[PDB]
Scaffold this motif. Sequence first.
Motif, PDB file in Angstrom:
ATOM      1  N   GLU A  53       0.791  -1.394   0.088  1.00 42.60           N
ATOM      2  CA  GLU A  53      -0.017  -0.011   0.065  1.00 42.60           C
ATOM      3  C   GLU A  53       0.808   1.218  -0.152  1.00 42.60           C
ATOM      4  O   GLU A  53       0.401   2.285  -0.541  1.00 42.60           O
ATOM      5  CB  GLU A  53      -1.024   0.002   1.262  1.00 42.60           C
ATOM      6  CG  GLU A  53      -1.959   0.947   1.257  1.00 42.60           C
ATOM      7  CD  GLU A  53      -2.887   0.922   0.079  1.00 42.60           C
ATOM      8  OE1 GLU A  53      -3.409  -0.358  -0.051  1.00 42.60           O
ATOM      9  OE2 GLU A  53      -3.863   1.935  -0.400  1.00 42.60           O
ATOM     10  N   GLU A  54       2.095   1.151   0.622  1.00 47.07           N
ATOM     11  CA  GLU A  54       3.053   2.401   0.695  1.00 47.07           C
ATOM     12  C   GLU A  54       3.252   2.790  -0.424  1.00 47.07           C
ATOM     13  O   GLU A  54       3.186   3.909  -0.914  1.00 47.07           O
ATOM     14  CB  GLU A  54       3.965   2.080   1.790  1.00 47.07           C
ATOM     15  CG  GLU A  54       3.766   1.547   2.948  1.00 47.07           C
ATOM     16  CD  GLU A  54       4.836   0.644   3.677  1.00 47.07           C
ATOM     17  OE1 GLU A  54       5.451   0.309   2.844  1.00 47.07           O
ATOM     18  OE2 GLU A  54       4.543   0.304   5.025  1.00 47.07           O
ATOM     19  N   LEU A  55       3.931   1.954  -1.468  1.00 53.03           N
ATOM     20  CA  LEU A  55       4.287   2.581  -2.421  1.00 53.03           C
ATOM     21  C   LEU A  55       3.298   2.754  -3.684  1.00 53.03           C
ATOM     22  O   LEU A  55       3.339   3.800  -4.186  1.00 53.03           O
ATOM     23  CB  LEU A  55       5.110   1.442  -3.183  1.00 53.03           C
ATOM     24  CG  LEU A  55       5.879   1.845  -4.583  1.00 53.03           C
ATOM     25  CD1 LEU A  55       6.608   3.086  -4.316  1.00 53.03           C
ATOM     26  CD2 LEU A  55       7.113   0.751  -4.937  1.00 53.03           C
ATOM     27  N   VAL A  56       2.225   2.313  -3.551  1.00 60.29           N
ATOM     28  CA  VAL A  56       0.900   2.748  -4.313  1.00 60.29           C
ATOM     29  C   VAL A  56       0.620   4.102  -3.878  1.00 60.29           C
ATOM     30  O   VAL A  56       0.344   4.928  -4.872  1.00 60.29           O
ATOM     31  CB  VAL A  56      -0.208   1.762  -4.224  1.00 60.29           C
ATOM     32  CG1 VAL A  56      -1.550   2.263  -5.273  1.00 60.29           C
ATOM     33  CG2 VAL A  56       0.391   0.345  -4.870  1.00 60.29           C
ATOM     34  N   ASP A  57       0.549   4.160  -2.561  1.00 59.92           N
ATOM     35  CA  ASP A  57      -0.226   5.842  -2.170  1.00 59.92           C
ATOM     36  C   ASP A  57       1.103   6.765  -2.478  1.00 59.92           C
ATOM     37  O   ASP A  57       0.840   7.766  -2.985  1.00 59.92           O
ATOM     38  CB  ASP A  57      -0.141   5.577  -0.771  1.00 59.92           C
ATOM     39  CG  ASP A  57      -1.441   4.892  -0.396  1.00 59.92           C
ATOM     40  OD1 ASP A  57      -2.396   4.871  -1.241  1.00 59.92           O
ATOM     41  OD2 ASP A  57      -1.289   4.468   0.857  1.00 59.92           O
ATOM     42  N   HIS A  58       2.367   6.296  -2.194  1.00 58.74           N
ATOM     43  CA  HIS A  58       3.332   7.222  -2.982  1.00 58.74           C
ATOM     44  C   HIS A  58       3.419   7.662  -4.489  1.00 58.74           C
ATOM     45  O   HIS A  58       3.525   8.532  -4.680  1.00 58.74           O
ATOM     46  CB  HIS A  58       4.826   6.686  -2.479  1.00 58.74           C
ATOM     47  CG  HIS A  58       5.884   7.666  -2.827  1.00 58.74           C
ATOM     48  ND1 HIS A  58       6.619   7.741  -3.808  1.00 58.74           N
ATOM     49  CD2 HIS A  58       6.540   8.488  -1.630  1.00 58.74           C
ATOM     50  CE1 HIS A  58       7.547   8.790  -3.563  1.00 58.74           C
ATOM     51  NE2 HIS A  58       7.534   9.278  -2.210  1.00 58.74           N
ATOM     52  N   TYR A  59       3.072   6.509  -5.481  1.00 58.38           N
ATOM     53  CA  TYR A  59       2.868   6.799  -6.788  1.00 58.38           C
ATOM     54  C   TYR A  59       1.810   7.734  -7.021  1.00 58.38           C
ATOM     55  O   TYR A  59       1.665   8.528  -7.773  1.00 58.38           O
ATOM     56  CB  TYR A  59       2.941   5.442  -7.460  1.00 58.38           C
ATOM     57  CG  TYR A  59       2.751   5.703  -8.879  1.00 58.38           C
ATOM     58  CD1 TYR A  59       1.458   5.652  -9.582  1.00 58.38           C
ATOM     59  CD2 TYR A  59       3.722   5.597  -9.629  1.00 58.38           C
ATOM     60  CE1 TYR A  59       1.062   5.701 -10.624  1.00 58.38           C
ATOM     61  CE2 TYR A  59       3.796   5.555 -10.966  1.00 58.38           C
ATOM     62  CZ  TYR A  59       2.132   5.667 -11.542  1.00 58.38           C
ATOM     63  OH  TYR A  59       2.338   5.543 -13.127  1.00 58.38           O
ATOM     64  N   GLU A  60       0.741   7.315  -6.270  1.00 54.76           N
ATOM     65  CA  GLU A  60      -0.591   8.058  -6.547  1.00 54.76           C
ATOM     66  C   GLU A  60      -0.706   9.319  -5.745  1.00 54.76           C
ATOM     67  O   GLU A  60      -1.833  10.432  -6.095  1.00 54.76           O
ATOM     68  CB  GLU A  60      -1.776   7.396  -6.135  1.00 54.76           C
ATOM     69  CG  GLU A  60      -3.207   7.664  -6.887  1.00 54.76           C
ATOM     70  CD  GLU A  60      -4.097   6.460  -7.011  1.00 54.76           C
ATOM     71  OE1 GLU A  60      -3.444   5.333  -7.288  1.00 54.76           O
ATOM     72  OE2 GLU A  60      -5.169   6.855  -7.047  1.00 54.76           O
ATOM     73  N   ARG A  61       0.195   9.979  -4.927  1.00 57.03           N
ATOM     74  CA  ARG A  61       0.217  11.171  -4.022  1.00 57.03           C
ATOM     75  C   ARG A  61       1.355  12.009  -4.859  1.00 57.03           C
ATOM     76  O   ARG A  61       1.502  13.247  -4.621  1.00 57.03           O
ATOM     77  CB  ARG A  61       0.649  10.758  -2.823  1.00 57.03           C
ATOM     78  CG  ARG A  61       0.499  12.132  -1.826  1.00 57.03           C
ATOM     79  CD  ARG A  61       0.513  11.988  -0.267  1.00 57.03           C
ATOM     80  NE  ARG A  61       1.612  11.180  -0.224  1.00 57.03           N
ATOM     81  CZ  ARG A  61       1.570   9.680   0.151  1.00 57.03           C
ATOM     82  NH1 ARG A  61       0.554   8.958   0.629  1.00 57.03           N
ATOM     83  NH2 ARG A  61       2.751   8.905   0.653  1.00 57.03           N
ATOM     84  N   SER A  62       2.235  11.348  -5.485  1.00 55.64           N
ATOM     85  CA  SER A  62       3.297  12.165  -6.380  1.00 55.64           C
ATOM     86  C   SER A  62       2.862  12.930  -7.327  1.00 55.64           C
ATOM     87  O   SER A  62       3.389  13.854  -7.814  1.00 55.64           O
ATOM     88  CB  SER A  62       4.629  11.259  -6.552  1.00 55.64           C
ATOM     89  OG  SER A  62       5.587  12.158  -7.452  1.00 55.64           O
ATOM     90  N   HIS A  63       1.829  12.347  -8.074  1.00 52.59           N
ATOM     91  CA  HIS A  63       1.141  12.690  -9.178  1.00 52.59           C
ATOM     92  C   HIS A  63       0.594  14.235  -9.028  1.00 52.59           C
ATOM     93  O   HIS A  63       0.707  14.930  -9.779  1.00 52.59           O
ATOM     94  CB  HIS A  63       0.419  11.823  -9.928  1.00 52.59           C
ATOM     95  CG  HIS A  63       1.130  11.059 -11.049  1.00 52.59           C
ATOM     96  ND1 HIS A  63       1.540   9.619 -10.429  1.00 52.59           N
ATOM     97  CD2 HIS A  63       1.219  10.925 -12.442  1.00 52.59           C
ATOM     98  CE1 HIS A  63       2.101   9.138 -11.365  1.00 52.59           C
ATOM     99  NE2 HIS A  63       1.907   9.942 -12.582  1.00 52.59           N
ATOM    100  N   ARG A  64      -0.227  14.190  -7.939  1.00 53.60           N
ATOM    101  CA  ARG A  64      -0.824  15.253  -7.527  1.00 53.60           C
ATOM    102  C   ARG A  64      -0.082  16.667  -7.186  1.00 53.60           C
ATOM    103  O   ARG A  64      -0.375  17.791  -7.500  1.00 53.60           O
ATOM    104  CB  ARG A  64      -2.016  15.232  -6.640  1.00 53.60           C
ATOM    105  CG  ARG A  64      -3.068  14.049  -7.122  1.00 53.60           C
ATOM    106  CD  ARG A  64      -4.275  13.945  -6.239  1.00 53.60           C
ATOM    107  NE  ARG A  64      -3.881  13.141  -4.828  1.00 53.60           N
ATOM    108  CZ  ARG A  64      -3.903  11.832  -4.879  1.00 53.60           C
ATOM    109  NH1 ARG A  64      -4.363  11.113  -5.700  1.00 53.60           N
ATOM    110  NH2 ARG A  64      -3.664  11.460  -3.779  1.00 53.60           N
ATOM    111  N   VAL A  65       0.977  16.243  -6.722  1.00 50.12           N
ATOM    112  CA  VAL A  65       1.974  17.455  -6.426  1.00 50.12           C
ATOM    113  C   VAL A  65       2.769  17.973  -7.662  1.00 50.12           C
ATOM    114  O   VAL A  65       2.869  19.201  -7.712  1.00 50.12           O
ATOM    115  CB  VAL A  65       3.040  16.828  -5.472  1.00 50.12           C
ATOM    116  CG1 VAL A  65       4.346  17.785  -5.261  1.00 50.12           C
ATOM    117  CG2 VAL A  65       2.539  16.959  -3.889  1.00 50.12           C
ATOM    118  N   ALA A  66       2.843  16.853  -8.386  1.00 51.36           N
ATOM    119  CA  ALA A  66       3.482  17.402  -9.732  1.00 51.36           C
ATOM    120  C   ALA A  66       2.475  18.158 -10.588  1.00 51.36           C
ATOM    121  O   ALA A  66       2.818  19.478 -11.111  1.00 51.36           O
ATOM    122  CB  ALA A  66       3.699  16.191 -10.825  1.00 51.36           C
ATOM    123  N   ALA A  67       1.127  17.846 -10.590  1.00 51.59           N
ATOM    124  CA  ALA A  67       0.229  18.568 -11.125  1.00 51.59           C
ATOM    125  C   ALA A  67      -0.040  19.948 -10.582  1.00 51.59           C
ATOM    126  O   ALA A  67      -0.012  21.011 -11.415  1.00 51.59           O
ATOM    127  CB  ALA A  67      -1.072  18.059 -11.399  1.00 51.59           C
TER     128      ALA A  67
END
Length: 316
Positions: free
Chosen positions: A14-28
Motif C-alpha cells: 500500500e505504501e508504494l501505491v500511495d506514494h505513486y498516486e500522491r506524487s502525481h498530484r504534487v507534480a500537477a
Amino acid sequence: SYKSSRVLVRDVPEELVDHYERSHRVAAFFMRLLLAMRREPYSLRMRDGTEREVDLDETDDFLRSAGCEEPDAVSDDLRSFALAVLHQDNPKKRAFLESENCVSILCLEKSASGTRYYKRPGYQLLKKAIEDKFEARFFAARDPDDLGRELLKTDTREGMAAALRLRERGVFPVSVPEHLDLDSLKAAMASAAERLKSWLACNQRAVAAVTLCDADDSPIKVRFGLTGRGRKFVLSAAGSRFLITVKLPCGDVGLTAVPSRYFWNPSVGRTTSNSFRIEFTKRTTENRRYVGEVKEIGLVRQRGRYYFFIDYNFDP
DNA sequence: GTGAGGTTCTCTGATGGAAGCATATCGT
DNA sequence: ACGATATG
RNA sequence: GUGCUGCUGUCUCCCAGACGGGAGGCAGAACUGCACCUUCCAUCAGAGAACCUCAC
C-alpha cells in the motif's frame, strides 16, 4: 551513455501505491502553480480532448489559493521566479542549475536557503589560498567569511534574489496539497519542470495546449535517486531475480522482481560511488557479458501493472 | 450502382523537446 | 566518518 | 518484462459442417524459436474503416 529495461512487480504494498498516486498530484500542482506565476493565459487539454482557454482571472484565483494574496503587486517577482525555475534565464548563471533545487525556498517555512556561498567560485580560491601572485581586497586580512557576504549581497542570480524578496512579504512559502518530504517534492518538481520545459519548447516551436500529469493517462516516473532527488533505494540479486528495496519515510519497502530473460544470471555489488554494479546476459543465443552501474530507477504504472524502469549505465 | 467532395472514429511514421546527479561544508 | 540541507 | 511466433488455456467471429480449417481478444508462461535503451509530450505528413448529401 544510457541503456534501459523494464522489470515487472506484482506485489507492491500500500505504501508504494500511495506514494505513486500522491506524487502525481504534487507534480500537477507544481505545473499549474508555475503556469500561474507565469501569468500568461494558456490553453488546457483535458482527458477526453478539449482545448479550453484559461485566462488571467482563474490564474489570479489559483495564485490567491496558493498564498499569493495580491499577485498584481508581486507580478514583477512571481514571473521573475518562474522563468528561473523553467530555465528561462541565461545559460550561464542559472539561479537553479537543477530545477528541483528551487523547492526549498518555495515550499519550506524554516529553510534558510538563500544565504549560502560554500560552493561559490571565489570562496573556493580564498579557502584554498589560506591553507597576489595567482590567477583568479579580501586577500588582505584573509576572512573568506566576509567574501561570502560580499558575493551574496552582490553577484545575485536573478530569480534567487527575487525568491528572497517574497519571503519577507509572507507570500512565497506555498501550501502544496500533500505533505511530501523534501526528497519526494524534489522528484515531483523535477518531473513537473521537465514536462513544462518540453511544453514551452513546443509552444515556442509552434510560433500549444498543456497536458497535466495523470496516474493513468499521462504517467510520470516517481524517480528514486541516491543523492536526494528522491527516496533512496538499494539493488541486489537472490538466485535469478532482482531484490529492490526503497527507503520511504514509512519504512523500508522491499520488492522482488519477477525474472527477466533480458537480465539472466544476475550478480550485483554495491559501489563506493553511490551506484550498484550489475552483470547479466541477453539470453537468446549469444550470451555476451555486460557491466552496468545503476544509480536511479523509475516507477510507472501501465495497464494496471507496476514496472520499475532500470536505467543503468554501460561501458562506452 | 460507383466517383467526387466534405465530416467522424480507430490507428502508424517522422522530426523536435524534457529526461534517467556531482560535490560541498557543518554539526554530532 | 556520517547525515542534513544547499547547490554546482 | 517488451514487438514475433507458441496451449499443455479461454472467449468470440466466419467457411465447408458433424473431418476440420480460416478472423480476431485476453490469460500468457512454470513451453522454446530471433532481438530488445526507454518513458512522457507537441506538431506535421501518410495509410485504413464509416458517415452524409449531391451528380453519372
